Design a protein around this ligand. Structure first.
Ligand SMILES: [Mg+2]
Ligand SMILES: [Mg+2]
Lengths: 414, 414
């Protein structure tokens, strides 16, 4: 209704599991709030340059702006933070990319990003974190990190099922728990907020299946289920068990020496994939002390939220970390950082997260060559120390570049 | 009934908030399972040596072994993992210390450590983490870390209120939620485990009050409330709000320039304490990238579990990290690592966590001089590179010591 669907350009098709991508696909993008105004222009410029370079003019993307967040209230009206047509358009055009979003406070509006993820049932939050040589890191050996985070995106405490303290509803569910379920474990039932953590068999098996398949297709060495299952037996503990059962039942997992770990043989390379588990607080130590031991990681919503941020900080990449939300019918690639409004319009922040989420987008489309030119671009620019302020602060001998100029620097190293 | 209460020795008294400690107090200790057999002897030896040195023979501790875990089934019988008299004795004798505990699987027995904490309402899990010069660390600047973790210990998802998937009870509470509470947010209601997260006003204000008081008494620079309140509004979001309200209402917190942060003036040094908050996944990046910005940390049960492990790993201290569980009527100091059964009896693991929890125990008793001789001992031994296998593996020029020998090394540097 306010989106101008491009004249030239053809929709991507989902031909039974397989993406049928035309030479001129229409890709929707959400600019995003704050620094979205800076980083999204830089990304459209390097993606265009990468598909121009690789397919020598044969392929072109028709970009189509759609709306969510604060820019949406300016286009559709003060009340509409998430237009229903954004939800239809992402689903229809199949892949889309977004910058950072602002969710308001004081209006009872829950995370606009969690709403997109859940409404479109984009159940896989895929977050690859690896070190780019030369970015400044807080740890001695960041090059030992090359992990891929499969974070469940549709259940856990993120479902948003909770009630306020002293509210009638909170009184009612605490009443049900104490009277009809006989729970005596609530220390203070008065002035008490209540939240519900769900975890289901379908929910975890579809995520773990996506993770083990990724391990076979890219012949990764292991899949690690992280959980706090010793304290949360029937949610986190059930996640670990249902994940081992899926490895046994669907991938022919066999005990590695008395268990509990399994071995899945990669049907293509013949190598064995180790299916293991590690408790979540111990895992937060292990990624710092022994990061070479881990590779593909499968976990629930909140733990993947913590794991992926903790892990992006140690390889010096809190500003260049990519992300994808993938479902069976569509995908939404995204900048994983915030809106940072103080810097908005200044052309100074790192466009690296949204650009690397764009390589993930192209790789998803099967435009592998274009996608490889962007990580070549990135490696080159960082290595040239021709970098943006957040990296330059920590480097000796670096040249300071604007957001846009670092866009040009990536194209220069392609 | 199987505990031999010491002939000489006098109980500590709680004379209205104040601990009245005799010159010969009876202190209960739980040896612990696995490597407890190694580390607890080393700790009794350096604590004895420290009180001998400081008070030149005037004060003495009468140690009294009590039982929990696997050693308890050997003393009281196969069925008793936690004897009720352990719970009475800790409460009566007021302070106690413990090594690592084994909780069994297959018997429906939940964490024996969480049972002690909750049964005795030891609502403060205090975890100080600071760098000891010379211990090997994975990060470039571990010396910038000197934080104190006030982790809430009586509520959150740790309360243990959950139901199995496909169980009658799980079906019943999912029925109540959908039918009587009208929740439509459960993606898969079939084959679904359910957990309950509670958070109350009394629960968080008593923890935050303990944290801000610690900041005044040791004139620390700030108190940081970490939470995932944007997604969990009525539990984690309520924790942040109730904590700021307690700073306003009880400590005279005033807005630092338009808010949201507050300033509390230390009534004793005149310095201002900054009361701030940071979202939990961003905090996991911030402790790695900017650890000098943070000091006393207040948080809920699961986030403090993750924060304290993540933080102990970066200063090279996963094996020398101390801990305390403090309530209004008693305290249980503890080794924060596991039982590590493969090494049990070999006299090879680090006795540093339980020894540093013993300095925390003495400091609690008011035996400050004894307590200061142990951290002097520790600093000396580590600096001398006269260390145990876990540190020696990562050091060049170190002398390898047994668990017991490192006990003697601490006494040697006192
Ligand atoms: Mg996050
Ligand atoms: Mg822990």
């Amino acid at each position: 209704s306010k989106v101008v669907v491009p004249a030239q350009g053809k929709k991507i098709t989902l031909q039974n599991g397989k993406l049928n991508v035309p030479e001129n696909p229409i890709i929707p993008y959400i600019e995003g709030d704050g620094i979205g105004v800076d980083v999204t222009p830089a990304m459209l410029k390097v993606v265009d340059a990468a598909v121009e370079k690789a397919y020598k003019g044969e392929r072109k993307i028709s970009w189509m702006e759609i709306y969510t967040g604060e820019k949406s209230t300016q286009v559709y009206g003060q009340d509409v933070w998430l237009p229903a047509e954004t939800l239809d358009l992402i689903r229809e055009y199949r892949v889309a990319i977004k910058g950072p979003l602002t969710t308001p406070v004081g209006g009872g509006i829950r995370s606009l990003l969690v709403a997109l993820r859940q409404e479109l049932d984009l159940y896989i939050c895929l977050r690859p974190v690896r070190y780019y040589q030369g970015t400044p890191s807080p740890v001695k050996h960041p090059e030992l990190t090359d992990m891929v985070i499969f974070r469940e995106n549709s259940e856990d405490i993120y479902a948003g099922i909770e009630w306020k303290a002293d509210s009638a509803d909170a009184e009612k569910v605490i009443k049900f728990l104490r009277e009809e379920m006989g729970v005596k474990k609530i220390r203070f039932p008065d002035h008490c907020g209540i939240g519900i953590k769900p975890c289901s068999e379908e929910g975890t098996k579809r995520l773990v299946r996506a993770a083990i398949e990724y391990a076979i297709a890219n012949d990764r060495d292991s899949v690690t289920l992280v959980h706090k299952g010793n304290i949360m037996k029937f949610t986190e503990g059930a996640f670990k068990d249902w994940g081992y059962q899926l490895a046994r039942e669907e991938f022919g997992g066999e005990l590695i020496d008395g268990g509990p770990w399994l071995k899945v043989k990669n049907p293509n390379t013949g190598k064995e994939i180790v299916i293991k588990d590690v408790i979540a607080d111990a895992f937060l130590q292990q990624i710092l002390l022994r990061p070479a031991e881990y590779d593909v990681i499968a976990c629930m919503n909140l733990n993947g939220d913590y794991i992926s941020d903790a892990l992006a900080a140690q390889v010096g990449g809190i500003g260049i970390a990519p992300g994808a939300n993938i479902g069976d019918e569509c995908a939404l690639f995204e900048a994983t950082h915030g809106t940072a409004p103080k810097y908005a319009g200044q052309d100074k922040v790192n466009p690296g997260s949204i650009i690397l989420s764009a390589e993930m987008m192209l790789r998803h489309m099967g435009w592998t060559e274009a996608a490889d030119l962007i990580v070549k671009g990135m490696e080159g620019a960082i290595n040239a120390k021709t970098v943006t302020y957040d990296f330059e602060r920590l480097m000796d001998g670096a040249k300071l570049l604007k957001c846009s100029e670092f866009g040009d620097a990536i194209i220069e190293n392609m």
